[PDB]
Structure 1
Amino acid sequence: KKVRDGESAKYFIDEENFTMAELCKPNFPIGQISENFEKSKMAKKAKLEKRRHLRELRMRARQEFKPLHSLTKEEQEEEEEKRKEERDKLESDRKAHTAIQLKGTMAIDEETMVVDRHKNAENEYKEKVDENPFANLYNYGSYGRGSYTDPWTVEEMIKFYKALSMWGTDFNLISQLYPYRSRKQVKAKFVNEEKKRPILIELALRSKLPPNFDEYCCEIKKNIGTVADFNEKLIELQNEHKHHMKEIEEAKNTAKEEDQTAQRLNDANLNKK
């Protein structure tokens, strides 16, 4: 009904309310409240919308098979929202560059460098873009590291048993074979699957299947080139040879500059007397 002191100390309190029994521990509205309505009401709402936000992130991460690139896609979407806010609230990109010609101008265009006193003057930029309302929320109890997981897919389990029958305990390849999970959680999956089942794992180590469909999935879902050991070894040897030639050329140029400096010092000693 509303906030009103019905009764207490005699029976189930019913003067103006919707209660008809004692032991109101379950939802714990009983009598009436007159403290912290909206700031405590809009806290579980914010928590619930952030949990639905993380769930739809976990749903979107299934499509793009790159976790951290999905996070950068998320921040790319929110900076698309930021440039939409730049369209909304407000040229506008008044910033600097790697050189001193910053603005408008690089200098004066009449006779000479006129605006060099103004071009030589970072912290004046565009920032009134991202405006968001406030709260008085919290993240305590335990904050920092953690693991956001889910009840695992049985088709992922079938793919895992087929993988372990095809390409076994290869932690980095197993983490890359599921390129939207992570590393420590699939290690907990390794010890969990090592726990409960001897039969299919023993038949899997009996099988010894050759790894071709695994490389097929790793070259399609990642779009990685996978150049062989001869091509990659030749590229690494060519990079090492180019670095050694650059170091030798730098040493020879430093020796030539030191010889030129010694000749210039001898010429200055000859011109001093």
Structure 2
Amino acid sequence: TAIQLKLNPDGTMAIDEETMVVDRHKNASIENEYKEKVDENPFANLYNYGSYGRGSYTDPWTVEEMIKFYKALSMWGTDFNLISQLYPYRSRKQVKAKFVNEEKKRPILIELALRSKLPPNFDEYCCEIKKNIGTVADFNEKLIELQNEHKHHMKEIEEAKNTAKEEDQTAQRLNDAN
């Protein structure tokens, strides 16, 4: 949506007065034409106390998930930060409540986990590295090296800052002389 010109035989190298301005609605109206049309039934909009309040329906847990839940709770004490991404589209809040409701549901199966203070049955070696094979890079030094690049760009724009400043005072000092 840049400005457009044309080449007349009468006046060559003339620029279009209508392309100088933009309408800001023709682009919006294209997609609004290509939206689905439905006829509102005033019964459909019904609302109750369960409206406009955050919280949703949790997808109930399966036993295939529990072996990735018990063992992630067997390795660490109780660490909700890194186990969240293990269940990729589950969030930090409802998985904390999954720790809470199991206290009343299975109080004794949890009580075996904190007694276990040792490396467990050695089958987590795959799940040790299945977590690691996502974006394989030395993260203990990957964050260091590009952070040093960032302050290098900030130092160069700081060099560009003062070198712009010194020539500016130099130029208008000459205007003060004249």
Does structure 1 conserve the Cα–Cα contact (< 8 Å) formed by 2:5 and 2:13?
A: yes
Does structure 2 conserve the Cα–Cα contact (< 8 Å) formed by 1:164 and 1:204?
A: yes
Does structure 2 conserve the Cα–Cα contact (< 8 Å) formed by 1:106 and 1:119?
A: no
Q: What is the match of residue 136 of structure 1? A: 45
Unaligned ranges ≥5, structure 1 = 1-97
Q: 3-state DSSP class of the match of 1:205?
A: coil
Shift of 1:185: 0.9
- Separation (CA, whole Å) in 1 of partners of 2:20 and 2:98: 68
Unaligned ranges ≥5, structure 2 = none
Q: What is the match of residue 102 of structure 1? A: 5
TM-score (norm 1): 0.39
Shift of 1:119: 14
Shift of 1:246: 2.8
Shift of 1:184: 1.1
- Separation (CA, whole Å) in 1 of partners of 2:42 and 2:5: 35
Moved more, 170-179 or 220-229: 220-229
Judged with a 3 Å threshold, the aligned counterparts in structure 2 of structure 1 residues 128 and 107 are, in CA distance, closer, same or farther, namely farther
Shift of 1:181: 1.7
Q: Which has the higher contact order (CA 8 A, sep 6+)?
A: 1
Shift of 1:179: 1.2
Post-superposition Cα deviations, 1:39-70, rounded to whole Å, max 9, x if no partner, equal: xxxxxxxxxxxxxxxxxxxxxxxxxxxxxxxx
Does structure 1 conserve the Cα–Cα contact (< 8 Å) formed by 2:74 and 2:114?
A: yes
- Separation (CA, whole Å) in 2 of partners of 1:164 and 1:226: 24
Judged with a 3 Å threshold, the aligned counterparts in structure 2 of structure 1 residues 125 and 137 are, in CA distance, closer, same or farther, namely closer
Post-superposition Cα deviations, 1:64-85, rounded to whole Å, max 9, x if no partner, equal: xxxxxxxxxxxxxxxxxxxxxx
Judged with a 3 Å threshold, the aligned counterparts in structure 2 of structure 1 residues 210 and 257 are, in CA distance, closer, same or farther, namely farther
Does structure 1 conserve the Cα–Cα contact (< 8 Å) formed by 2:74 and 2:116?
A: yes
Identity of aligned residues (%): 99
Judged with a 3 Å threshold, the aligned counterparts in structure 2 of structure 1 residues 130 and 190 are, in CA distance, closer, same or farther, namely same
Moved more, 201-210 or 235-244: 235-244
- Separation (CA, whole Å) in 2 of partners of 1:157 and 1:183: 17
Does structure 1 conserve the Cα–Cα contact (< 8 Å) formed by 2:5 and 2:16?
A: no
Does structure 1 conserve the Cα–Cα contact (< 8 Å) formed by 2:84 and 2:90?
A: yes
Does structure 2 conserve the Cα–Cα contact (< 8 Å) formed by 1:166 and 1:211?
A: yes
Length, aligned pairs only: 172
Judged with a 3 Å threshold, the aligned counterparts in structure 2 of structure 1 residues 175 and 143 are, in CA distance, closer, same or farther, namely same
Q: What is the match of residue 222 of structure 1? A: 131
Does structure 2 conserve the Cα–Cα contact (< 8 Å) formed by 1:107 and 1:119?
A: no
Post-superposition Cα deviations, 1:123-181, rounded to whole Å, max 9, x if no partner, equal: 99999999999955546543321231244212323331222122331101121111122
Judged with a 3 Å threshold, the aligned counterparts in structure 2 of structure 1 residues 179 and 221 are, in CA distance, closer, same or farther, namely farther
Q: What is the match of residue 150 of structure 2? A: 241
Equivalent of residue 117 in structure 1, options 18, 24, 31: 24
Does structure 2 conserve the Cα–Cα contact (< 8 Å) formed by 1:171 and 1:187?
A: yes
Largest Rg, 1 or 2: 1
